[PDB]
């Protein structure tokens, strides 16, 4: 009756959950802006996903409050680089760390 675990590559936080839709991404961005963090967009190759430094999409959205623009920038990154893994981050300046970091598209 027991079932075997099917092994596959994973992508940090939220990778063990089903891929997020627009509503869930918007909720995460709203959380990020509610915590005072600056949303950021990164992309890198699937084989280079483990890189510490991804290609930076434009600049971090300091003081940005519109989740619609954040999601539109995510989609623009996807359109410009369609084979690239895309990650959403949130900068915490006080802690000098990232309060949130997860991939939106897992590459192909």
């Amino acid at each position: 009756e027991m079932q075997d675990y099917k092994q596959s590559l994973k992508y940090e936080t939220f990778s063990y959950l089903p891929p997020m839709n627009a509503e869930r991404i918007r909720a995460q961005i709203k959380y990020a802006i509610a915590q005072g963090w600056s949303p950021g967009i990164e992309h890198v190759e699937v084989k280079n996903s483990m890189n510490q430094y991804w290609y930076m999409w434009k600049l971090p959205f300091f003081g940005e409050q519109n989740v619609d623009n954040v999601l539109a920038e995510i989609e623009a990154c996807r359109s410009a680089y369609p084979t690239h893994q895309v990650k959403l981050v949130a900068y915490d300046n006080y802690a000098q760390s990232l309060g949130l970091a997860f991939v939106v598209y897992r590459g192909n």
Binding site: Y5, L17, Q28, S49
Partner: protein, 444 residues
């Protein structure tokens, strides 16, 4: 005895070391007398003035009791506040401060019990100690992990596993989804499993799991050794094989050894996990001992990246304040005084990085929303039974724990009351995770 070592009027300097002692005195003895007794025996140890006393500045080199307070709910005990000049201690020696504070005062015969509740480390003395080798944020940057608490597991049984079998437990645990696995406080080098074989097979398993998952993996390899030479050799071998984190028992191993290992870890870029074995012989008795908040301050002064602090959920709702207070002491830069949470002194840490909080012991998928709500992202959750007891295996248990963690983190980020809606959130996550579903079925 009275007028000499207790000054009600004395205002303590910002560089003074302050200690709070819960004195349960013998009935009939004077409160101020007992306070001066703790102050004297912790600083000078005598009252009879000898000819060598007159060669020194007696007004300076002495500990003084400056305030006595009633203990709420305990008429048989009182709080004694004692100020110590910073000159009385070796700079950067938690060993020396600890010895000066607790060497002989607990053997005082005129008190029924003595508890060291809180100790104020001034920023001047704080700036001298090395502190945590890396800290929470630097460890997060090194491990490339953000936005969620870390997951750990203690490999069980504590006895019997060969190097390869222990490695083949660690490998499934890591490949299942846990960020870390944990060597037990008992496992340093036993006849059934030698330390070098441990390190080699553990590194092999960690590398295999990291390659097969795509996430940075680690194992707290225990370097607690009979000798500092052996401990340094084991840590150097761990670095040579590439282990990113090691573990030490800072109480049984010793504060001197822990400080040396922390300095070595800061020098060599190796993360340090700290286990709090034996802490119960010291901090459990309510009327005699030294508090775990003081032990936490001592540990973060000595150096360490992780520290066991308790599961918090393991206590009743009305007994969580002291645990939360020492959690704040371990993690935060400045902790204001809070009598309800047991913080007796304002504790300024300056730039010293925080230490990850480790929750371990009898916790599984059901406690998890409460664990997330209480600890926040800057914590490590350990699942020994909650991972090894999974009917489908270590990998399935780790996957269940990871899925539950990610679901709870996302629910908290969405603004939901994760403790109020924990069952609904976990069920919704289990609709996509059979391993998680069977995990709740097992541990309901």
């Amino acid at each position: 005895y009275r007028q000499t070592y207790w000054m009600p009027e004395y205002t303590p300097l910002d560089s003074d070391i302050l200690a709070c002692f819960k004195i349960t005195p013998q009935p009939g003895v004077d409160r101020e007398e007992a306070a001066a007794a703790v102050a004297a025996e912790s600083s000078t140890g005598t009252w009879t003035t000898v000819w060598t006393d007159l060669l020194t500045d007696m007004d300076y080199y002495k500990g003084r009791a400056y305030r006595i307070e009633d203990v709420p709910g305990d008429d048989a005990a009182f709080y004694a506040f004692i100020a110590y000049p910073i000159d009385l201690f070796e700079e950067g020696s938690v060993v020396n401060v600890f010895t000066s504070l607790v060497g002989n005062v607990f053997g005082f015969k005129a008190v029924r019990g003595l508890r060291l509740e809180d100790v104020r480390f001034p920023l001047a003395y704080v700036k001298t100690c090395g502190g945590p080798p890396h800290g929470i944020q630097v460890e997060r940057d090194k491990m490339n992990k953000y936005g969620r608490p870390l997951l750990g597991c203690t490999i069980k049984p504590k006895l019997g596993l060969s190097a390869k079998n222990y490695g083949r437990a660690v490998y499934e645990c890591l490949r299942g989804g846990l960020d870390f696995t944990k060597d037990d406080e008992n496992i340093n080098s036993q006849p059934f499993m030698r330390w070098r074989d441990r390190f080699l097979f553990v590194q092999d398993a960690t590398e295999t799991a990291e390659a097969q998952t795509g996430e940075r993996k680690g194992h707290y390899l225990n370097v607690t050794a009979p000798t500092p030479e052996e401990m340094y050799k084991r840590a150097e071998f761990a670095k040579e094989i590439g282990a990113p984190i090691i573990m030490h028992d800072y109480i049984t191993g010793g504060f001197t050894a822990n400080t040396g290992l922390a300095k070595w870890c800061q020098d060599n870029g190796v993360l340090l996990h700290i286990h709090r074995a034996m802490h119960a012989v010291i901090d459990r008795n309510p009327n005699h001992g030294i508090h775990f908040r003081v032990l936490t301050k001592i540990l973060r002064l000595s150096g360490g990246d992780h520290l066991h602090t308790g599961t918090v959920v393991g206590k009743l709702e009305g007994d969580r304040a002291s645990t939360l207070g020492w959690i704040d002491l371990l993690r935060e830069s400045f902790i204001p005084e809070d009598r309800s949470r047991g913080i007796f002194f304002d504790q300024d840490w300056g730039s010293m990085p925080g230490v990850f909080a480790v929750a371990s012991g009898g916790i599984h998928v059901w406690h998890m929303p409460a664990l997330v709500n209480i600890f926040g992202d800057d914590s490590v959750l350990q699942f020994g039974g909650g991972t090894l007891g999974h009917p489908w295996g270590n990998a399935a248990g780790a996957a269940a724990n990871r899925v539950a963690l990610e679901a709870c983190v996302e629910a908290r980020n969405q603004g939901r009351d994760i403790e109020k809606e924990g069952k609904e959130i976990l069920t919704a996550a289990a609709q996509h995770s059979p391993e998680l579903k069977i995990a709740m079925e097992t541990w309901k």
